[PDB]
């Protein structure tokens, strides 16, 4: 009945604070270091957990994106289920972070199949570009079992694109080609003049140009007769149904053109035949503007580069060059950490191998007898030797076949190899290691 009592209604801030927690840890802005979203973090963590040793196994999408609740996802599983198909496909990403087996849709029809008829796995495109997963800092909150952000080699924010709309901010990071980003990161490692990465939409063979600096995207029209042409492509943000209904069907309803659906296996194929009630002007420049105006072949665009940094703060970058520079600056330190830890582990491994070789050659030499030692007196006398005492248990767990010359000479040579590999780790630097990692990605 201990009654402590204060008339502090300001505790109602715990609502807003909680709402702040509901509008901070569950935002839609991606993360600059790892290139993920809050939903995709849990999705990829669950996929990695399920894959285990047999990463080639195709897990059901329902199991992939429905069991994320216990991982620390304070939202409905529907968001994870839908975000597991808008990221694991190939028509929307230059870098598929999750390979799939099933009907994931295409640019013709941007719709997934179902919840359980498809499968997913951690693609081979993730292991070559997301090294050092276990060094990601753990989240401040315990329930966030997946780390704050994985550590990739090239920034995944740039690739695969992303379009999010938060409270007061909007991110529309345009996708970039893998080669351009790799070259930019490699050249920014050595501090040269940074070359702006290009833009390469997935499954796009049209044109993307920055005449006004707005990064606009335009398709290709190809005349085949005096009153026919073969539209090979249209701007990216278009599927068959929405394109038809929104622009092309009203154009036909105006009594101007008639379209023959020829959507082949390679993009759109919307061939169109005009009629009498249309301009069909000459001079090849007015008809040029008309052909890319009436059929919506011209798309304006803008880059709103806003993203969360390594910490909880959110920053807006004017150009991708600053993003590349900051990401590589962070990854340099996160690679130095791995360098130090590798040195520390390799020294101990070499010492253990040296002790093992010493024990094996002393035993085969007969200086110390394996048999006749009462109450495993071996361990007792090894505890008072210069190097033995550190690994006595490991020095006793020696198999019979480890005594013969086959597993003794090779053991000594392996110890020497561990020594020289420790030297290699000692003498190497961050720049060379990161350059090797950058080259490894392809």
């Amino acid at each position: 009945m201990q009654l402590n009592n204060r008339d502090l209604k300001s505790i109602i801030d715990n609502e807003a604070l909680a709402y702040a927690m509901y509008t901070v840890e569950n935002r839609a802005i991606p993360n600059m270091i790892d290139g993920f979203k809050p939903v995709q973090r849990f999705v990829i963590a669950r996929a990695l957990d399920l894959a285990r040793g047999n990463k080639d196994k195709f897990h059901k999408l329902a199991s992939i994106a429905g069991g994320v609740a216990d991982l620390g996802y304070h939202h409905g599983e529907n968001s994870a289920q839908d975000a597991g198909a808008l990221m694991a496909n190939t028509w929307n990403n230059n870098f598929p972070l999750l390979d799939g087996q099933g009907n994931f849709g295409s640019r013709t029809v941007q719709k997934a199949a179902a919840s359980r008829y498809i499968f997913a796995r951690v693609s081979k495109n993730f292991y070559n570009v997301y090294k050092d997963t276990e060094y990601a800092p753990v989240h401040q909150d315990k329930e966030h079992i997946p780390p704050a952000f994985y550590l990739p080699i090239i920034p995944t924010v740039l690739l695969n694109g992303v379009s999010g709309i938060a409270t007061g901010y909007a991110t529309y990071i345009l996708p970039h080609s893998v080669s351009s980003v790799k070259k930019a990161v490699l050249q920014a490692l050595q501090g040269k003049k940074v070359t702006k990465p290009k833009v390469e939409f997935p499954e796009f063979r049209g044109e993307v140009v920055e005449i006004d600096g707005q990064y606009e995207i335009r398709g290709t029209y190809k005349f085949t007769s005096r009153t026919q042409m073969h539209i090979t492509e249209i701007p990216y943000k278009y599927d068959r149904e929405t394109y038809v209904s929104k622009i092309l069907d009203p154009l036909e309803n105006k009594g101007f053109i008639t379209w023959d659906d020829a959507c082949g296996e390679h993009g759109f194929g919307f061939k169109v035949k005009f009629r009498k009630e249309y301009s069909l002007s000459d001079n090849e420049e007015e008809r040029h503007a008309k052909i890319m105006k009436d059929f919506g072949l011209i798309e304006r665009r803008s880059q709103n580069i806003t993203v969360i940094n390594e910490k909880g703060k959110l920053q807006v970058y004017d150009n991708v060059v600053d993003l590349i520079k900051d990401f590589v600056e962070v990854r340099k330190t996160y690679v130095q950490k791995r360098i130090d830890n590798k040195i520390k582990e390799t020294e101990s491994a070499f010492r253990l191998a040296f002790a093992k070789a010493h024990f094996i050659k002393k035993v085969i030499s007969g200086e110390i007898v394996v048999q006749g030692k009462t109450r495993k007196e071996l361990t007792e006398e090894l505890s008072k030797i210069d190097m033995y005492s550190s690994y006595v248990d490991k020095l006793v767990g020696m198999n019979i076949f480890h005594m013969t010359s086959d597993e003794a000479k090779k053991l000594a040579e392996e110890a020497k190899a561990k020594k020289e590999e420790n030297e290699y780790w000692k003498t190497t630097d961050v720049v060379t290691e990161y350059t090797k990692d950058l080259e490894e990605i392809k």
Binding site: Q101, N103, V109, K111, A113, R240, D249
Partner: protein, 200 residues
């Protein structure tokens, strides 16, 4: 003028064209990427549809999806089987219970109002393989559970893949199924009223 259609160039023209009354727009996208450019058509369904009998003919016409399909095939309610924009009609649905147990009987009940259509046998079904065995480089296409059980005795590399649902198929599988199908046809007994009267 319907909108969901995949109308081919031979709509109305005499040919060996086929109509796919498949379920799920996701499948019809695969069809667009796989279809024959001139022969094979198609149309997506909405899903669970009301039982065909239990009400009047104008009340067949009341339903939106039924209206779209009769407009597409051109077989308007109350007439003889003529003016067929598509020479053939095929049904293909997710084969666990979504279309086999829900869509197939209702669609046959609706198509039953033209016994001439069943007499021609123009209404058919493409059997999707229930299980796929991935052996070596070339996979096999066991079409039913009984075949799988009777043919699994002597086969190496018994890697099994269930094809429950049309979404499980890849582009190669769907291409093979469409280009080289089995085309099971619909029933025609001595009486065409009692066997679907079991529906109610």
């Amino acid at each position: 003028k319907v909108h969901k259609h995949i109308k081919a160039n031979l709509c109305g023209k005499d040919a060996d064209t086929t109509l796919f009354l498949t379920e799920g727009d996701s499948a019809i996208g695969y069809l667009i990427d796989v279809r024959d450019k001139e022969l094979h058509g198609g149309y997506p369904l909405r899903g669970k549809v009301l039982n065909s009998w239990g009400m009047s003919y104008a009340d067949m016409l009341k339903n939106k999806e039924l209206f779209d399909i009769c407009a597409i095939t051109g077989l308007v309610l109350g007439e003889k089987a003529e003016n067929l924009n598509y020479h053939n009609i095929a049904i293909m649905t997710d084969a666990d219970h979504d279309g086999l147990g829900s869509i197939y009987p209702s669609l046959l009940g609706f198509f039953s109002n033209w016994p001439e259509l069943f007499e021609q046998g123009r209404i058919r079904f493409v059997k999707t393989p229930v299980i796929i065995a991935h052996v070596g480089k070339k996979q096999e296409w066991f079409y039913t559970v009984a075949e799988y059980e009777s043919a699994k005795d002597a086969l190496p590399k018994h890697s099994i893949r269930y094809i429950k649902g049309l979404g499980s198929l890849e582009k190669s599988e769907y291409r093979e199924m469409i280009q080289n199908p089995v085309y099971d046809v619909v029933k025609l007994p001595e009486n065409w009223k009692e066997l679907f009267e079991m529906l109610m």
